[PDB]
Amino acid sequence: HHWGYGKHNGPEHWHKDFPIAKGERQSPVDIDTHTAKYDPSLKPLSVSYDQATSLRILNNGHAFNVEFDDSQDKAVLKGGPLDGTYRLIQFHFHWGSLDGQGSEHTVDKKKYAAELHLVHWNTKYGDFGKAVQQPDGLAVLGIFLKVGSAKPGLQKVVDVLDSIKTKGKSADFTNFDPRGLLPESLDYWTYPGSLTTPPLLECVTWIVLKEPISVSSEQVLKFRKLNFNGEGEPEELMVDNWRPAQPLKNRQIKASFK
Ligand SMILES: NS(=O)(=O)c1ccccc1F
Numbered sequence: 001h002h003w004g005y006g007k008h009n010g011p012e013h014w015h016k017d018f019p020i021a022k023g024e025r026q027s028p029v030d031i032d033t034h035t036a037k038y039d040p041s042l043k044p045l046s047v048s049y050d051q052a053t054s055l056r057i058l059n060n061g062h063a064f065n066v067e068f069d070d071s072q073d074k075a076v077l078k079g080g081p082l083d084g085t086y087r088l089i090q091f092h093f094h095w096g097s098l099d100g101q102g103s104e105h106t107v108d109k110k111k112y113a114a115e116l117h118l119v120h121w122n123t124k125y126g127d128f129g130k131a132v133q134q135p136d137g138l139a140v141l142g143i144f145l146k147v148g149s150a151k152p153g154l155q156k157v158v159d160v161l162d163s164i165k166t167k168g169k170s171a172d173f174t175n176f177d178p179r180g181l182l183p184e185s186l187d188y189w190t191y192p193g194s195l196t197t198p199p200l201l202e203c204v205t206w207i208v209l210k211e212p213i214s215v216s217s218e219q220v221l222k223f224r225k226l227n228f229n230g231e232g233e234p235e236e237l238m239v240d241n242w243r244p245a246q247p248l249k250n251r252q253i254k255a256s257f258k
């Protein structure tokens with residue numbers, strides 16, 4: 001049946017239903033740090049999350065999403081490589097069964113334990129569903145997670161995960177401040193790519209921060225207690241929900257920093 005992360009429905013199979021899997025601007029990629037070019041004309045990112053309104057957290061069977069009210073310019077990303085204003089719609093993570101894997105992007109082939117994606121759509125397209133049909137429709141801010149000290153601003157997410165263990169469960173999730181998930185520095189790499197899951201649409205400006213955040217072993221362990229299945233279906237732990245790096249093809253990764 002449907003796409004997933006198993007042997008039988010995982011990333012090597014996706015191209016049969018989503019032929020853009022083999023396209024010219026797929027994500028994630030390996031970020032070769034020596035080959036990335038500093039682009040002095042890239043602007044600082046502007047992350048404006050002070051008025052963010054989180055609403056709900058949802059296990060969609062592939063990851064969990066913390067969803068936001070995106071019906072006004074409440075949490076926006078601008079600047080950097082972007083033209084215009086991009087509104088935060090949701091964030092989610094990808095993680096591993098082991099601390100040695102889990103990120104989608106890699107840095108000089110290094111895999112991190114997990115990767116956070118803050119997903120934003122270009123307000124010139126009016127809604128997310130129209131934006132994903134455009135080559136500049138989305139901006140995803142990607143942040144690596146390494147295991148060490150706890151991230152105190154992650155704990156409220158971790159603690160609600162027992163309430164959304166299985167596919168299709170949701171829970172109210174108000175007043176969560178996504179600024180507590182960011183590193184100190186906003187230095188980044190950027191390149192044009194895609195959604196990393198089906199439908200794999202080539203609509204994303206990727207902005208990947210150089211500085212990882214640290215999370216504790218106990219925090220990532222709780223992500224690994226989630227289930228891909230629905231309640232009353234056989235239990236399959238939600239782990240290794242990452243797509244491996246895809247060919248860079250005719251793209252250059254730019255760096256905001258030297
Ligand atoms: N992982 S990602 O590219 O941020 C993503 C965001 C939304 C839908 C599908 C996706 F794949």
Ligand SMILES: [Zn+2]
Nearest residue numbers: 093094117196
């Ligand atoms: Zn993602």
